[model samples]
Target chain A: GLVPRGSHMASMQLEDLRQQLQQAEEALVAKQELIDKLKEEAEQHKIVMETVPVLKAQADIYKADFQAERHAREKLVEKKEYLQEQLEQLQREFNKLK
Target chain B: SDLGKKLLEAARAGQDDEVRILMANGADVNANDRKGNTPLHLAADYDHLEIVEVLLKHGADVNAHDNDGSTPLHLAALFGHLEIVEVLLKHGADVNAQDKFGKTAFDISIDNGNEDLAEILQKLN
Candidate 1:
């Protein structure tokens, strides 16, 4: 009586389990594709991150030079004004002599 | 107040009041730069008649020569500033003064085709 139930139920149950295994395998394949896509995107981000430091450093140098020149120009502008004032005063005195 | 510096600047720019202020502050009338260009030199070169008068009153050397031995008269003649040349002559600028190139104010006027100035310099010579 141990093997007396040899019916279509057993076959149906085997087919159902195999279908579940196939579904799980397909799902695992999709997960693998998703992982590969994510890995590829991560590689692109790695390249960008690697170049970012060099670009940031270059920009920092440009900014430093710009600020230094700006400061020099400001001092020059102030000096120009002082020179102009002195020039006008001298002109005034010169005019009176005539 | 860089006295001489201010005076030189004022003279170069023909600023009468600034020239007077610098003079009052003891700015050297004969103060020269590395090239020995005094305020009078600039004033004469630029044809600033009033500044020239101011510098002359302040006792600027009328015949002071630069490193190149070019006097204010030489510059005035070279630049064809007849009025400045006259003023320089009136202030006792040496008409016979020659530059390192052996060119007098008259010669410079001739070289630069300044007939009016050359005529005056020739008369003085």
Candidate 2:
């Protein structure tokens, strides 16, 4: 017996499905390459972030060190302020250091 | 006057601890003696890094000019104190400030062997 028109239609549908599946697989392959590129880009960003702190650290070191000395200077400056009057009135006390 | 002068002397001598002691006693961070040079100027000229930082933090004038119209950066560059130069720049010392000879810190840096410093300072001029 000869096949019906419906069989031909069924064959064409199967061919369409195979083509669609092939395209989907091809898309997945392309996506994997993009993923590899993104990974490399992310690594570069990480490295850049790491080395970037070296310059900032040196600046911070100088600032913090100075801050410590500045506090010390402030104390002596205030002491000298009080001593000015004593140095003038109590010549003995002034001469103690002089 | 003596109190601030002590600061200038200590800063000039690179005595960071003595500098702090005198500075705490109200030493004039910007007091120029003899040649219009402040404590900061002395610190930079002598390449006293700690003293420079202390002076700067205690309101030492970064843009101060001496008798020769030299800023702290100019002295730092001329002295090969890269660390001092970096700290001064960070503290906003005018890299483009000219001396009596119309020389910028960058020019002095280039004229000296500090190409790295010249690279940074010249960007402003």
Candidate 3:
């Protein structure tokens, strides 16, 4: 029987090192991609900040328009209530006059 | 002569002149040291107001995290440096930036007994 001492162990160690190296390289690439994504996100945020104020002002205008419409609806409700009260008062007056 | 080492020393010493010199010499203002803290991070940790201003003006990432994922805002709040915290915020630091421990600047300031800083962060939202 002839065998080389530690050859099998050395081969196993080499394979483990290769696997570690591959994993490390993959991690590095992933990190680089993350950094790129962050940069892109930052740029998008900058653009949003630049345009958001004008858009917000437009939104406020729409909100005010909606509130004006709401107030008109409230006025109509009040008028309806007044007309209802007047009708009841007229009915009572007619009965009293009879 | 590692640039990170020189930058760290300059930051820790609050040598505004040296930091500017190093930055002019092409030193990465964001280069991390052995502890994974960039020069701006060290300056912020030490509460060096002038150094912080300089680093920020030179385009250092105000929101960059250290090894613990603590931003410069976290360091300012932890040290109770209200001025530095305000400066970082003015430069667009995220008041709600969550760290590795899921703690925001508001949470960190409250934990550090900085009720005023916490209130300031609350007002921001």
Candidate 4:
């Protein structure tokens, strides 16, 4: 069957519309990918910010405990000196008696 | 007979006479007990000023550390024994020695609220 002249023009217009539809679909896909990437990055940043403070507080507590232990060790050294003095005095008295 | 045990007891008891006698008879001032504590450690632990003085005069290692790597200066600062702390410093005790736990003598003083000791330690640095 022979098509009318107006029908031929309509067919050309329909082809143009199909091309436009394909381009729009591709653009939408690209935009959706970009949006997905951005959302993932934002979620990762949020997670880091949320957890950093807890890690810092744990480090501070460890530092405080370390300081307490150092003080205890220092006290032990002083006691050693007093004992040495007593040992000397005892020897001197023994020598005098001998 | 563990010399360290006897020395620790004498130092803790503040037996100035006995300490001097032991030293005169060749007792090592820096001798360590089973826990690696010295007579100097005991003196500082008990805050015995006279005994601390005697040990320093006899050339005890004021900075000698126990098994945990703590010096007599650490104890003096912890207990707020300013005189003993000064003596330790004068005898060349390390002002910045860190213990096995990685804490400085200054850290110990600050934690114990001994601000004067902390200030003195800061000045030494």
* CAPRI docking class of candidate 3: incorrect
What's the DockQ for every one of the candidates?
0.00, 0.00, 0.01, 0.00
Off by over 4 Å in 1: A1-98
- By lDDT, is 2 or 4 better? 2
lDDT score at residue B47, model 1, on the 0-100 scale: 80
Chain A accuracy as TM-score for every candidate: 0.68, 0.51, 0.41, 0.55
- Indicate the residue-level lDDT of A64 in model 3: 100
Segments in model 4 whose C-alpha atoms lie over 4 Å from true places: A1-98
Which residue pairs does candidate 3 place in steric collision?
A: none
- Of 1 and 4, which scores higher on lDDT? 1
Question: Over the stretch B1-125, how does candidate 2's per-residue lDDT look in tens digits?
Answer: 68888877898999879988887788678888889889999898897888898888998899999998988888888888888888998887776577776676766766666768856765563
**How far does residue B76 in candidate 1 sit from its true spot (Å)?**
0.4
Model 3 lDDT per residue over B80-108, tens place: 88888888888889887766765677767
C-alpha displacement of A48 in model 2, angstroms? Answer: 79
lDDT of 1 by residue, A1-98 (tens): 11222233322333344446677778888999999999999999999899989999999999999999999999999999999999999999999986
Q: What share of the true interface contacts does each candidate keep?
A: 0.00, 0.00, 0.00, 0.00
Give the candidates in order of lDDT, highest first. Answer: 1, 3, 2, 4
Reference-based TM-score, model 1 = 0.54
lDDT of model 1 at residue A90?
90
